[PDB]
């Protein structure tokens, strides 16, 4: 079958026995910066296998009452091996990614997740006019969660799920690269995101190029099974990573 899938980057391989297809950016495969699109003049580093490989973030639990989660990139990978090290020593960076979201249940469980990558997912504050800090939206590979109720805590982002933290209709997030994990047919989702920005390269700490959101559109449900929660794991591999402007490492 086509359900079978194998992906190898560097020293890591991912396999899936029940998948859908592989969504590719806006039909654009990741690629290194061309000479006719560059501004920064120094010779870049392209660590290759050391950085372009699969990194598995901490797992999370999908429970009957879960509402949704988000991770901002590249921040989510800032501590991952040499990818994180290269981010720290360089002023500029550029990369695409293979995102593989894993979630297995059973033929007797039901549920359905939207797995989307939102470019420039600029978010609103819990209380309009009140500024929040970076910590309200990203911190290493920590998963952030949406809420059903509207957020009151001004130190937070407006987490009410139906507006996806952006002031738009959550059911319209489908115009962004996405895949669905319907427990009845899938067991994982794979999206290849190319580099998307208004400038050729950018600083990797200061700018979150895109946000991965995993949202349960149909709640997790099951009968008298001994299994309770269903884990969700995110594994991602940078692709065509290149960096410019080497100098001392950024403390954080």
């Amino acid at each position: 079958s086509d359900r079978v899938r194998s992906i190898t980057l560097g020293n890591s391989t991912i396999t899936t026995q029940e998948c859908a297809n592989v969504v590719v950016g806006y039909g654009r495969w990741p690629t290194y910066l061309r000479d006719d699109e560059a501004t920064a003049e120094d010779q870049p580093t392209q660590p290759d296998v050391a950085t372009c490989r699969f990194y598995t973030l901490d797992s999370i639990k999908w429970e009957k009452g879960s509402v949704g989660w988000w991770w901002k990139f590249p921040e989510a990978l800032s501590d991952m091996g040499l990818f994180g090290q290269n981010m720290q020593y360089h002023y500029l960076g550029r990369a695409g990614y293979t995102i593989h979201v894993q979630c297995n249940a059973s033929k007797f469980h039901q549920g359905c997740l939207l797995v989307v990558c939102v470019p420039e997912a600029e978010m609103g504050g819990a209380v309009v006019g009140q500024a929040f800090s970076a910590t309200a939206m990203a911190n290493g590979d920590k998963a952030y969660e949406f809420t059903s109720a509207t957020q009151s805590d001004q130190t937070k982002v407006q987490t009410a799920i139906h507006n996806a933290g952006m002031g738009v209709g959550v059911g319209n997030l489908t115009i962004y690269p996405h895949q669905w994990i319907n427990l009845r047919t899938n067991n994982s989702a794979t999206i290849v995101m190319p580099y998307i920005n208004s400038v050729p390269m950018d600083n990797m700490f200061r700018h979150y190029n895109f946000t991965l959101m995993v949202i349960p559109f149909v709640k997790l449900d099951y009968a008298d099974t001994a299994s309770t929660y269903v884990p969700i794991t995110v594994t991602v591999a940078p692709m065509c990573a290149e960096y410019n402007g080497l100098r001392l490492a950024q403390a954080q």
């Binding site: 420039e120 504050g125 006019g129 407006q158 009410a160 738009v168 115009i175």
Partner: protein, 222 residues
């Protein structure tokens, strides 16, 4: 087509400047160019994340005599000067200052009674496309300004009456229209649902998805 949808002149700003007043600042306008203060144009542009286009700018300037006890005067036709000051250039502090010489900045001298002034500006961004949104900071630290405002540095527009001091004050109002042309747009977004609250931030007040009806089967009007 996006060219057609965006290609109509829209009012992006308006302000008044007096011909004569005791307050120096009431006699000229100083506007930091942006497209976020007038709600209609803003919502349209904001339907796309990145935009690249040339810009046609048209100015509509009208004057009215201020009400007062004694209004009899015979003032000749008025002439206005509109000067564009790119970021960093000398800014005028009063109607009669040296900066108005415009040896290098572009200016338009226009006289009332004539067709509205107009000109084209090419795609002037330092980037490859204009950004309607910017989820980031100005400082590498992840501090400083947050949001699209950090990328706005298009300069200012300054306007004054040329040598129009009148015995009794006259108030002119300038309206500036933008019409993008030769347009390209990337990565479309959901239209703004919540009303706008600030000119330089995405800030909003939660607004419901849509309006309601009595039940899920109601299909009549009364």
């Amino acid at each position: 087509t996006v060219e057609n949808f965006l290609g109509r002149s829209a009012c992006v700003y308006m302000e008044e400047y007096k011909t004569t007043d005791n307050d120096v600042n009431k006699k000229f306008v100083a506007w930091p160019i942006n497209t976020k203060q007038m709600v209609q144009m803003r919502r349209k542009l904001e339907m796309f994340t990145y935009l690249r286009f040339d810009m046609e700018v048209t100015f509509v300037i009208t004057s009215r005599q201020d009400p007062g006890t004694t209004l009899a005067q015979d003032m000749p036709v008025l002439t206005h000067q509109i000067m564009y000051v790119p970021p960093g250039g000398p800014i005028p502090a009063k109607v009669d200052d040296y900066a108005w010489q415009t040896s290098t900045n572009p200016s338009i001298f226009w006289t009332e009674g004539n067709a509205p002034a107009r000109m084209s500006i090419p795609f002037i961004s330092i980037g490859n496309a204009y950004s309607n949104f910017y989820d980031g900071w100005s400082n590498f630290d992840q501090r400083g300004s947050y949001g699209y405002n950090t990328l706005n540095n298009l300069g200012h527009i300054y306007v004054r009456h040329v040598s129009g001091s009148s015995p009794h004050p006259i108030t002119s109002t300038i309206r500036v229209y933008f019409k993008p042309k030769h347009t390209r747009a990337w990565v479309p977004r959901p239209p703004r649902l919540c009303q706008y609250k600030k000119a330089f931030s995405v800030d909003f007040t939660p607004t419901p998805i849509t309006d309601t009806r009595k039940d899920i089967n109601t299909v009549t009007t009364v």
